[PDB]
Write an enzyme that holds these catalytic residues in place. Structure first.
Site, PDB file in Angstrom:
ATOM      1  N   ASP A  34       5.125   5.791  -0.097  1.00 31.62           N
ATOM      2  CA  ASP A  34       5.803   4.499  -0.073  1.00 31.62           C
ATOM      3  C   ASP A  34       5.225   3.491   0.920  1.00 31.62           C
ATOM      4  OD1 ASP A  34       7.522   5.855  -1.901  1.00 31.62           O
ATOM      5  OD2 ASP A  34       8.721   6.582  -0.214  1.00 31.62           O
ATOM      6  N   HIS A  50       6.328   3.240  -7.581  1.00 34.08           N
ATOM      7  CA  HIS A  50       5.560   2.104  -7.097  1.00 34.08           C
ATOM      8  C   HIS A  50       6.150   0.763  -7.512  1.00 34.08           C
ATOM      9  CE1 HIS A  50       2.016   5.171  -7.312  1.00 34.08           C
ATOM     10  NE2 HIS A  50       2.877   5.449  -6.349  1.00 34.08           N
TER      11      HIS A  50
HETATM   12  N1  LIG Z   1       8.700  -6.917   3.338  1.00 40.22           N
HETATM   13  C1  LIG Z   1       7.671  -6.256   2.785  1.00 40.22           C
HETATM   14  N2  LIG Z   1       7.907  -5.329   1.885  1.00 40.22           N
HETATM   15  C2  LIG Z   1       6.769  -4.764   1.435  1.00 40.22           C
HETATM   16  C3  LIG Z   1       5.466  -5.037   1.791  1.00 40.22           C
HETATM   17  N3  LIG Z   1       4.585  -4.222   1.097  1.00 40.22           N
HETATM   18  C4  LIG Z   1       5.354  -3.478   0.352  1.00 40.22           C
HETATM   19  N4  LIG Z   1       6.689  -3.748   0.522  1.00 40.22           N
HETATM   20  C5  LIG Z   1       7.814  -3.074  -0.107  1.00 40.22           C
HETATM   21  O1  LIG Z   1       7.845  -1.767   0.422  1.00 40.22           O
HETATM   22  C6  LIG Z   1       8.233  -0.834  -0.611  1.00 40.22           C
HETATM   23  C7  LIG Z   1       7.240   0.301  -0.689  1.00 40.22           C
HETATM   24  O2  LIG Z   1       7.741   1.327  -1.535  1.00 40.22           O
HETATM   25  P1  LIG Z   1       6.912   1.842  -2.793  1.00 40.22           P
HETATM   26  O3  LIG Z   1       6.912   0.754  -3.810  1.00 40.22           O
HETATM   27  O4  LIG Z   1       7.474   3.168  -3.148  1.00 40.22           O
HETATM   28  O5  LIG Z   1       5.363   2.044  -2.328  1.00 40.22           O
HETATM   29  P2  LIG Z   1       4.266   3.002  -3.060  1.00 40.22           P
HETATM   30  O6  LIG Z   1       5.013   4.240  -3.506  1.00 40.22           O
HETATM   31  O7  LIG Z   1       3.207   3.308  -2.001  1.00 40.22           O
HETATM   32  O8  LIG Z   1       3.703   2.186  -4.214  1.00 40.22           O
HETATM   33  C8  LIG Z   1       8.404  -1.639  -1.890  1.00 40.22           C
HETATM   34  O9  LIG Z   1       9.784  -1.843  -2.156  1.00 40.22           O
HETATM   35  C9  LIG Z   1       7.633  -2.924  -1.612  1.00 40.22           C
HETATM   36  O10 LIG Z   1       8.125  -4.051  -2.307  1.00 40.22           O
HETATM   37  C10 LIG Z   1       5.222  -6.031   2.761  1.00 40.22           C
HETATM   38  O11 LIG Z   1       4.134  -6.406   3.224  1.00 40.22           O
HETATM   39  N5  LIG Z   1       6.410  -6.604   3.211  1.00 40.22           N
HETATM   40  O1  LIG Z   2       7.839  17.981  -5.536  1.00 41.02           O
HETATM   41  P1  LIG Z   2       8.003  16.502  -5.251  1.00 41.02           P
HETATM   42  O2  LIG Z   2       9.025  15.834  -6.157  1.00 41.02           O
HETATM   43  O3  LIG Z   2       6.689  15.734  -5.229  1.00 41.02           O
HETATM   44  O4  LIG Z   2       8.632  16.395  -3.751  1.00 41.02           O
HETATM   45  C1  LIG Z   2       8.020  17.058  -2.634  1.00 41.02           C
HETATM   46  C2  LIG Z   2       8.053  16.147  -1.438  1.00 41.02           C
HETATM   47  O5  LIG Z   2       7.204  15.002  -1.676  1.00 41.02           O
HETATM   48  C3  LIG Z   2       7.920  13.818  -1.406  1.00 41.02           C
HETATM   49  N1  LIG Z   2       7.395  12.788  -2.294  1.00 41.02           N
HETATM   50  C4  LIG Z   2       6.820  12.987  -3.521  1.00 41.02           C
HETATM   51  N2  LIG Z   2       6.348  11.894  -4.065  1.00 41.02           N
HETATM   52  C5  LIG Z   2       6.650  10.905  -3.144  1.00 41.02           C
HETATM   53  C6  LIG Z   2       6.395   9.526  -3.127  1.00 41.02           C
HETATM   54  O6  LIG Z   2       5.500   9.133  -3.890  1.00 41.02           O
HETATM   55  P2  LIG Z   2       4.973   7.590  -3.936  1.00 41.02           P
HETATM   56  O7  LIG Z   2       4.479   7.277  -2.526  1.00 41.02           O
HETATM   57  O8  LIG Z   2       3.838   7.562  -4.963  1.00 41.02           O
HETATM   58  O9  LIG Z   2       6.178   6.754  -4.364  1.00 41.02           O
HETATM   59  N3  LIG Z   2       6.855   8.821  -2.070  1.00 41.02           N
HETATM   60  C7  LIG Z   2       7.501   9.471  -1.097  1.00 41.02           C
HETATM   61  N4  LIG Z   2       7.780  10.766  -0.989  1.00 41.02           N
HETATM   62  C8  LIG Z   2       7.322  11.437  -2.059  1.00 41.02           C
HETATM   63  C9  LIG Z   2       9.381  14.170  -1.645  1.00 41.02           C
HETATM   64  O10 LIG Z   2      10.228  13.277  -0.956  1.00 41.02           O
HETATM   65  C10 LIG Z   2       9.431  15.595  -1.105  1.00 41.02           C
HETATM   66  O11 LIG Z   2       9.659  15.677   0.295  1.00 41.02           O
HETATM   67 MG   LIG Z   3       6.882   4.932  -3.671  1.00 40.87          MG
END
Ligand SMILES: Nc1nc2c(ncn2[C@@H]2O[C@H](COP(=O)(O)OP(=O)(O)O)[C@@H](O)[C@H]2O)c(=O)[nH]1
Ligand SMILES: O=P(O)(O)OC[C@H]1O[C@@H](n2cnc3c(OP(=O)(O)O)ncnc32)[C@H](O)[C@@H]1O
Ligand SMILES: [Mg+2]
Ligand SMILES: Nc1nc2c(ncn2[C@@H]2O[C@H](COP(=O)(O)OP(=O)(O)O)[C@@H](O)[C@H]2O)c(=O)[nH]1
Ligand SMILES: O=P(O)(O)OC[C@H]1O[C@@H](n2cnc3c(OP(=O)(O)O)ncnc32)[C@H](O)[C@@H]1O
Ligand SMILES: [Mg+2]
EC number: 6.3.4.4
Lengths: 431, 430
Positions: free
Chosen positions: B16, B44
């Site tokens: 994330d 994502h």
């Molecule tokens: N305020 C703010 N939010 C951000 C920024 N970059 C990402 N985010 C937010 O942070 C969150 C990251 O979670 P996620 O989407 O799961 O990231 P990913 O799994 O790595 O693609 C999202 O809700 C984005 O909209 C930033 O520069 N500023």
């Molecule tokens: O067997 P799983 O379901 O993969 O869970 C095992 C461990 O991995 C973590 N985990 C798995 N995918 C994750 C994710 O992916 P993105 O960054 O692509 O959004 N972002 C954050 N945490 C993530 C889970 O929270 C858990 O501890």
């Molecule tokens: Mg994510």
């Protein structure tokens, strides 16, 4: 200079036993570090040096070089009894102080006795259920990799930390397996006691692999060689699934099995046997189940080192070779066991696959197709001469040279070494 | 000869970090956007033109109509979830997606019983050891477990003889019922749905190895690889066993797409300005105090869809250095800088101490991280809104210093700075 040195890699281009041990041994004579990145002792690598024949499985083939450090990466699955059983077999052969030049990555997983047992059970069950199994080596490789994915398997660092917690973990893993196969028998206490002993024995050889390899690649210039195991077409992702092994035998496994990025990967050599062989069950387009197949088995000693089980043999198949090159991106080839063909008047090599008279565009992801395809061959004139004593390009007869060129030309990769014998000196380097 | 190189975006911490946001930005001029590992356990977020999308199996680039989204052989696919995700986005404008989406036929299938068994194993763990992994219960662990066992079924199997597919499906489902006699499995029901999905997906399926090989050796194209999960969640290199079950590191690009390392170009490390992780497991810089509440609140750190609040803490350079050692980051994307806009001071973990003595490298035994004491360096905050920054000169002096700090301590240049969720809320520096 931020990158650091690059490792040289030796991979299998077909279905294994292509001569990775022989090639690694040759290249390890001046290597600082020789290592394994994936697989376990399901692999068997023969090395012949000074009228002395070695048989490696878990120990990197370079273990012979007393001035090099042999390294087992995080991608490898280790069965401790087998590991030490292999070492002592080689000790009785002249291998000395190996434990002093062997380093083991603390992130590598452990193959437990019940993993091998469950491997036997699954194999037998799948045989009495669907009348066909995989042809596994029964060394517990699949089950251990299965435990890895589940995050239920145990690692070297675990065996070395608080044993009480390790025992608790072991027991739990053991149970989950007895549930899997109620028939499975596990002497948990007998095995934990043996494991207790292995911990002590292995402790001094263990180290953090990621850091070990990093420092090796970013300090004073060092030559690092990576010995792949199994082969491209046995790759869990790209092989003839499900008739494959459970790890990535292709180039990517170097990165995932040692924790080094792509920029630290240099030359990647594809070891290709002058003809094709396979061990377990599975498609084998150019398989010759006849006099030719028999001639290759006997002249090529194609049978299990301890089992004696004959391996299936066939003509060189360019389809799997070009496919293997697509995923591995070989920088040069090692064409081995050329001398095997010294006796044939003519030699056949598969150049493509056909379905209804038409060439298929690429290697089939569905294994069942390979069984329905027609192999298109090209017949090359043999050299009917003894290449066994050949040591230089010029010593090879016209038809032998032409055979080598046929491989280069059709793969698009240059041949750097030609094998004409089992021992280290029975090799020809072309550049 | 060698062919073109792909551009890679990887998670540098525990997920994330904003991989979706980075990929969306880079995909604007990409011909092919692909996923190489994982499944819909990933989440994502993409924010463009007042629209917020959340992808899971669909590559974040699915939004760009002039590009081809590709799901490689390393990904594990759950058909129901795939189409539910596609439909939830169709209701957001995503149109003709099934026309620009290609699926590798070597990718494995996550079956309904894999998802059930996941939660089943997770519920059992909590009953025995009173502690589980923190899985997203999407069956990723069990599916990858079946793959290694070569018991799992693949895309090409689904589209081949269905009678064969059915028998294999049945055996697989039975073996799983032995694992948990509690498990149900409406075989005919599930097999029925699968026969339907088979056709719906058939026209998008292709040979991945050939598709990608030709894409890199034919007319020059721009390939973008979207990683999932993150470095410290890597099955091999993460905080095992508290990790996902696939290689989230650079090597996974090679095993998940069938391309050699020479076809790997720029590899970007997405690193959030502060650290987070959802699920069980050591988190050295974790802030269970007023600070953590502020990061979680201002950073909206809660389950993308799973609904679980994320744990927060200060930036941690120990895990970023370790991640770099494995991934070979060529550049970084420092995200969510704006979250720190209010802080008077910001601490950054620089090393771990065990019994008062610094340890030399990140430990393989997750239990050790559980006892370390983090050594911090405290930097000045800028106390100003950077949300509107679109240029490096727009960042106040102390915000710039925070960027340089990260760059100098990692030896990797920061190429992008995120100041918001939306696509335009970014600053390219290099
Ligand atoms: N305020 C703010 N939010 C951000 C920024 N970059 C990402 N985010 C937010 O942070 C969150 C990251 O979670 P996620 O989407 O799961 O990231 P990913 O799994 O790595 O693609 C999202 O809700 C984005 O909209 C930033 O520069 N500023
Ligand atoms: O067997 P799983 O379901 O993969 O869970 C095992 C461990 O991995 C973590 N985990 C798995 N995918 C994750 C994710 O992916 P993105 O960054 O692509 O959004 N972002 C954050 N945490 C993530 C889970 O929270 C858990 O501890
Ligand atoms: Mg994510
Ligand atoms: N005659 C001959 N035998 C060879 C040659 N190269 C290798 N061999 C033998 O062929 C066998 C190869 O099988 P194996 O050792 O399992 O190869 P690996 O699994 O790839 O390391 C060994 O017994 C080698 O000694 C060669 O050029 N000529
Ligand atoms: O679960 P496993 O025990 O790994 O078996 C699965 C499949 O893999 C094949 N196989 C495994 N290692 C092999 C080997 O290794 P080296 O080339 O390193 O000497 N050479 C040849 N074939 C090999 C087996 O024949 C079987 O079909
Ligand atoms: Mg062998």
């Amino acid at each position: 200079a931020a990158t650091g040195s690059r490792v040289t890699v030796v991979l299998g281009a077909q279905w294994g036993d292509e001569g990775k041990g022989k090639v690694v041994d040759l290249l390890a004579t001046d290597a600082d570090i020789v290592s394994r990145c994936q697989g376990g002792n399901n692999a068997g690598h023969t090395v012949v040096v000074d009228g002395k024949e070695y048989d490696f499985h878990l120990l990197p083939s370079g273990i012979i070089n007393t001035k090099a450090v042999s390294f087992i990466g995080n991608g490898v699955v280790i069965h401790l009894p087998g590991l030490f059983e292999e070492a002592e077999k080689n000790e009785k052969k002249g291998l000395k102080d190996w434990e002093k030049r062997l380093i083991i990555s603390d992130r590598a997983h452990l193959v437990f006795d019940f993993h091998q047992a469950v491997d036997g059970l699954q194999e037998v069950q799948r045989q009495a259920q669907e009348g066909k199994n995989i042809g596994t080596t029964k060394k517990g490789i699949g089950p251990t990799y299965s435990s890895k994915a589940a995050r239920t398997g145990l690692r070297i660092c675990d065996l070395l930390s608080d044993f009480d917690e390790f025992s608790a973990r072991f027991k739990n893993l053991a149970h989950q397996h007895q549930s899997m196969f109620p028939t499975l028998e596990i002497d948990v206490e007998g095995q934990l006691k043996r494991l207790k002993g292995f911990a002590e024995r292995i402790r001094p050889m263990v180290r953090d692999g990621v850091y070990f390899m990093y420092e090796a690649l970013h300090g004073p210039p060092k030559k690092v060689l990576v010995e792949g195991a199994n082969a491209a077409l046995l790759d869990i992702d790209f092989g003839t699934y499900p008739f494959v092994t459970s790890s990535n035998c292709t180039v990517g496994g170097v990165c995932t099995g040692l924790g080094i990025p792509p920029q630290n990967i240099g030359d990647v050599y594809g070891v290709v046997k002058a003809y094709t062989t396979r061990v377990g069950i599975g498609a084998f387009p150019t398989e010759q189940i006849n006099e030719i197949g028999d001639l290759l088995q006997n002249r090529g000693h194609e049978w299990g080192v301890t089992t004696g089980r004959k391996r299936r043999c066939g003509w060189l198949d360019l389809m799997i070779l070009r496919y293997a090159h697509m995923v591995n991106g070989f920088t040069a080839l090692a064409l081995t066991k050329l001398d095997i063909l010294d006796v044939l008047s003519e030699i056949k090599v598969g150049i493509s696959y056909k379905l209804n008279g038409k060439r298929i565009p690429y290697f089939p992801a569905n294994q069942e197709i390979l069984q329905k395809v027609e192999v298109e061959y090209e017949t090359l004139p043999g050299w009917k001469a003894d290449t066994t004593g050949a040591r230089k390009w010029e010593d090879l007869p016209p038809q032998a040279q032409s055979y080598v060129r046929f491989v280069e030309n059709h793969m698009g990769v240059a041949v750097k070494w030609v094998g004409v014998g089992k021992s280290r000196e029975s090799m020809i380097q072309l550049f």
